[PDB]
Write a protein that binds this ligand. Sequence first.
Ligand code: Q4L
Length: 185
Amino acid sequence: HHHHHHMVHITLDRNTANSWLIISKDRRQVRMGDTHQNVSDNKERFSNYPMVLGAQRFSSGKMYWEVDVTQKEAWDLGVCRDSVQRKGQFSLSPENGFWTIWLWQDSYEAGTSPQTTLHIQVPPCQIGIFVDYEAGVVSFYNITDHGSLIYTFSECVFAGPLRPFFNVGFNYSGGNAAPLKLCPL
Ligand SMILES: COC(=O)N1CCN(c2ccc(F)cc2)CC1
C-alpha cells in the first residue's frame, strides 16, 4: 500500500474510556488497570468492555494511522460511528456502527456479522488502519509483514462522523496487560 502519506496524529479521549483504563499523559497509549481508576461516571464511557475512542472525528477524506499490539493476547481495533452505544452488551458489527478486526484465543477475525476468519501467516506487532470516507472503505494492514493486506470492508455505510476505536481486552489470564500504543508518523 501507499497510504502512509494520509497519516493523521490520533490521540485518545479520556472521557470515553472505560473507568479501569489508564491513558498516558501524551494520550498516545492505553492499558488495562488492575482496578477502577478513580474517575467519575458519564454517559460517554464504555461500561461493559475495556474500550476507548480517539478524540478525532472524520466526515471526509482519507486517513491512516498505526497501532502497536506487541505481546497482547486479545484486542479490537478499527473505527466506529460517533453515535455507537456506550452502555450494556453489544456485538462489534457494521449494523451497530463498528468496522473492526480483533485477536481472540490465537485467531484473528473481522467484525462482520457473523465474524470472518482472517488468514495471517506473520502475527502482527503493528496494525495499519486506512479509512476512505467517500469510497466507503476501511482497510487493515500487517506492518510486521511489509504492509500486507489483512482485510477490507467495502460498501461501508458510515452514516455519521467516524472515530478511531480501541479495545485493550480483559486480562483474566495475566498475559494481556500490555498497552495499545499509537505509533509515531
Ligand atoms: C506498570 O506497567 C505495567 O504494568 N505495564 C503492563 C505491561 N507492559 C508491557 C508492555 C509491552 C509488552 F510487550 C508487554 C507488557 C508495560 C506496562
